[PDB]
């Protein structure tokens, strides 16, 4: 998980570059650490591929699908000595295991805390993943427009775009100018209103129950207080 | 639920890979929801009866190591509850017969119905705990010897040993709290020896306080003989 | 006998590709083909160069340094009128629609460089190719008698292969989406019927 | 609530004012956006209400970062801080207030047991079309809130029937129904009750309360038993 | 020159300097144990309390 | 034995700085260093002045009065081509990237004043410094062989100290955030163990 975070940081570094460039051994120590991380990733879904009680069920769990659009393009990248900023943002989808690994370090010991970190993790992972997607769309162009209507957005400009979008603020200073980009923004507004009206709002309201008679008494000095118990009613 | 969870999940219980799954028709109240949210990987609740086969399958009763049936101590009719628990025993033993079931019985007379059920086997480890009989007997036996109930309660219950330094009664009290009861086959060097000699060798040389014994030879099954005389020798088994 | 969850998710994945094999075919039918077949409407003519002149009106191009520079130089304009064979009229040449839609008044937008003299020489070097070869060797030239009555293209916006990949790869996604569903049912039917051969 | 809202809003406006007056420091403070403080206040009010005109917006990277953090913080303390405290200031009861004394409209207060059955027959005869022109408005005072059938029946008569929640054993409720100005009060007794005498004594209690409030009044009441009728004669008024 | 930095430096050194003094005074008081402060909470301590009227007027004025 | 609320909020404040010591380090790694190390990629050359000329194309600067005035005057352009030592090519000088990105066609944007003659004299005064000292005293000059193949800078956008404060002050915030947590635990452990020395 920590090396997955490191690969995501490598993606964040590589998002400040053009579409591709030719390397041999070093340009920013770019692929040199990426190859090591991805070889460890290959070994990690290697030894749990043999741990599959169902060889098909492991193949379609989205926990190696994230580990699966990344590693063969890294092998092609080191076979060709050039980089590509493709579906590497899918590594951010592995942030869904953050509550699971944070439970291992004895930091969270509360079911409300586990559920809260699960919600924040699926929110941040979905948001960064979709931001990487529409970043990848907007760096390129509409291909029927021969890749000419490219919108040179930073990844983090695009992150700002999705936070302004999902909260229905919509400044319009930054927006998708490509047809495929507008199409994905339509789909993601519908998906965001889907999993806000169906995923969270019955789990948000599990973290909203409060009881209005609890706590203790503030011992104010000088105020002798009486505790009154027994049957208590408007009459008595 | 609280008393059972406390003894079962007591820290002194050390490493036990047993997860308690609770099946009850009534949904848990807020105090139950807090108590179930005090144990995550350890306690799961499910809604449903044990009188429906699908619910037994949902709780995986067949793979379950044992099923414990708890009877409300306070009820309008003791016999009615006892018959409900016997009904639950019949349902579980009809689903999967090779299972241990530990149950609570409010009345001593209602215990016979379990014996009437064919699958139930006492020797197989199926056991029925009669609350009325045990509580009254503990009170009774204590009428003979004042304070026996506390001694017997501190044996089986896992209770946390606390270091006390000051000369109080609690310091001498906790010297015997951490004792428990244990069942064990005797060694082969005790064959044909008298019970007082074996108790002397257990308490003198290796500080064990032996109470009772098994005894079976072609008669009815192996009774529990509390402190036999020198009249009865110790068998190999 | 029941569909297991490995089998069931393969069915859910297999239907997801059958649907998206239709939708990607359905999107590209008017998002890719609608600009394509309008470009394929203009036919190959065989036209001759009428006249090549200049105007004197500058037009502001935009060069760059590479690290996001917005340098804007200027280039002179050249109007290459040609004599069509089919619609036999006086019409301009255009390198593509991208040269046409940005500046229809010019025939050749040079790649914009920093110095104006660099952009000047790229004009006359292109102009020298059309001041020596006039009338002789009539070339293939694309013209539409529907949209642009007086504009002739030199190329297309696309290739012959632009009809291929819009029909191919959603149908490739469609067939593979079927082969997931078919091989799930067939292997299950071999795993539910051949088990009872006892 | 209004104080924490205004204080948070002005504080965050001052923060992003301070950010936007300066620039991004890696841009060597060159992308400064010369915002007034109150332009920035307008920006945050347009932002938090999710209106988002886009005429004014943060053009600095650190500014965009704080606007992301403050949109998340604003949706945090709107979904977690106020909306269970907003809904403490939202509870209203739909049967209270008093009766508008319209001049010329002699109103009747109807009390006693009130239900769809008892109320329907009286309303039908009183509001019958053949009754022609009668300026009498029936006002019903009952402790129990009306059921959905009662709500439909009361919403079949608008300028004619008003319900109010309250007893006739409290003087304030009698004042709310304007009993003193009321032409007459009709007390309806549930025909079906566990004890006839108990209900009869309750209706006599209601008579005593109304005649103690305002003695010069006509009261028409229902009595379940003939023997209980004498108590009304015993009342002096 | 642009001496904007000294203000924030002064406030933060007042914060974590004054925070460490409270921690180390609560360190050395419980480290020396290993090997007229009475009425001063009453001159102004009562005055700070909202119950005092002068105290309420002081809160309103500040 | 319990953490008191003064102790507990110090732990909550101490963790808040340990987290923000990471995040401020994490933000500035690609929000401060990513523009920084690209500027540190261009190396020190030792280049000679090739030629200093003018063009005649005006460029519209923007002066001000002080109380939000948008006065726009104009200034002539000067192209100072220099001969590099390392990449040995004909390339312009630029005062910084800010002079480069706004007007790459000029070498020196003067500070814009109201009168055009004021902006005119600031050009030729700068030009006189480069029309007398030509070829002699080859100066240090920054050039990148990756991004700008024909643009040479005179300065950097930043200093050597730009690597310091992006790594220093989040780590200063990180250590102080640790020292709050450590001294809370240690003083509590001296306040819970040394109390029982009775
Ligand atoms: C290019 C186009 C890309 C656009 C696609 C972006 C979204 C795809 C990913 C969306 C999120 C998918 C992942 C959603 C997901 O996994 O949900 C689940 C998490 O709960 P969890 O597993 O912990 O339950 C534990 C169990 O014990 C419940 O009791
Ligand atoms: C079911 C899903 C199906 C998806 C799979 C099908 C869809 C995906 C492939 C489409 C077919 C191949 C694309 C066409 C490739 C062939 C054409 C090609 O090579 O395009 C290049 C540009 O690429 C560009 O935009 C620049 C971007 C290069 C690719 C970067 C990644 C894009 C990933 C996008 C995702 C160069 O041309 P160029 O500029 O000179 O012309 C402008 C000039 O004429 C100016 O007038
Ligand atoms: C599927 C819809 C995609 C078809 C949209 C399309 O091709 O039209 C383009 C512009 O429209 C568009 O950008 C519309 C993009 C938004 C598509 C939203 C569809 C949601 C369903 C043409 O571009 P033009 O140069 O002709 O103008
Ligand atoms: C630069 C970055 C700056 C950005 C930071 C802006 C927000 C920070 C301040 C947010 C608000 C913090 C203050 C929030 C706060 O104090 O809440 C409390 C108020 O309730 P109160 O005390 O009365 O309860 C009385 C008790 O008796 C409850 O029973
Ligand atoms: C954990 C948190 C860590 C936060 C603490 C660390 C971050 C905060 C300090 C950064 C390091 C010091 C900043 C750099 C100071 C050294 C550099 C400096 O003095 O900058 C001045 C400008 O200031 C400016 O923007 C103008 C604003 C001055 C400061 C006003 C308050 C800003 C507070 C912002 C908050 C002058 O340069 P100048 O213009 O000539 O260059 C453009 C010229 O080259 C045109 O080409
Ligand atoms: C942490 C993210 C901050 C990194 C954002 C960043 O440095 O990119 C700048 C522009 O992007 C940005 O303004 C993005 C600002 C929005 C950041 C939103 C991040 C929310 C998480 C570069 O500026 P440019 O000149 O290269 O374009
Ligand atoms: C948020 C916290 C940690 C920041 C406060 C730390 C202060 C003490 C540090 C952070 C960066 C430092 C500044 C770095 C840049 C200039 C260099 C020079 O022109 C004079 C001093 C000056 C202005 C320094 C003064 C002290 C300084 C402001
Ligand atoms: C309340 C207490 C903590 C105040 C201490 C704050 C310190 C950090 C502040 C307040 C006074 C400040 C000084 C003000 C003026 C002097 C001389 C000037 O030419 C340069 C800066 C310099 C040298 C400053 C250094 C930082 C400074 C010493
Ligand atoms: C040249 O001219 C004719 C008539 O315009 C045209 O049809 C054809 O494209 C060219 N001829 C040949 C043989 O290609
Ligand atoms: C050439 O000249 C004119 C001008 O376009 C045109 O009308 C005529 O048809 C052309 N003749 C030939 C032979 O192409
Ligand atoms: C001047 O010239 C050389 C070669 O370009 C260069 O390496 C160096 O920076 C300068 N020489 C010295 C001694 O600084
Ligand atoms: C100077 O002249 C040319 C023009 O840039 C260049 O190719 C050559 O290398 C330079 N010579 C020296 C000695 O710098």
Numbering used by the authors:
A (entry chain D): 120 to 355
B (entry chain A): 356 to 592
C (entry chain H), F (entry chain G): 2008 to 2205
D (entry chain C): 238 to 474
E (entry chain C): 19 to 53, 93 to 119
From the paper:
The Slo1 channel, also known as BK or MaxiK, distinguishes itself from other K+ channels by its unusually large single-channel conductance (~10–20 times greater than most other K+ channels) and dual regulation by intracellular Ca2+ and membrane voltage. Because both Ca2+ and membrane voltage gate Slo1, it serves as a hub in numerous physiological processes that couple membrane excitability to Ca2+ signaling events such as muscle contraction, audition, hormone secretion, and neurotransmitter release. Slo1 functions as a tetramer of the pore-forming α subunit, which is encoded by a single gene, Slowpoke (KCNMA1). In this study we present the structures of a mammalian (human) Slo1 channel consisting of the α subunit alone and in complex with the brain-enriched β4 subunit.
The final protein sample of Slo1 co-expressed with the β4 subunit contained both the α subunit and the β4 subunit confirmed by SDS-PAGE and mass spectrometry. Structures of human Slo1 in four distinct states were determined: Ca2+-free and Ca2+-bound α subunit alone as well as Ca2+-free and Ca2+-bound α-β4 complex at resolutions of 4.0 Å, 3.8 Å, 3.5 Å and 3.2 Å, respectively. Likewise, the two Ca2+-free structures of the α subunit (± β4 subunit) are also the same within the accuracy of our measurements (RMSD 1.1 Å). The distance between sidechains of these two residues was hypothesized to shift from 10.6 Å to 5.5 Å when the channel opens, allowing them to interact. However, these two residues are more than 27 Å apart in our open Slo1-β4 complex structure and remained essentially static in the closed Slo1-β4 complex structure, making any direct interactions very unlikely. Contrasting the large Ca2+-mediated conformational changes that occur within the α subunit pore and gating ring with the absence of conformational change in the β4 subunit gives the impression that the β4 subunits encage the α subunit channel without interfering with its Ca2+-mediated gating conformational changes. Within the outer leaflet of the membrane even lipid molecules that mediate interactions between the α and β subunits remain unperturbed. Within the inner leaflet of the membrane, where large gating conformational changes in the α subunit occur, interfaces between α and β subunits – especially surrounding the more centrally located TM1 of the β subunit – undergo change. The structures support this proposal because the Ca2+ binding sites are unaltered by the presence of β subunits.
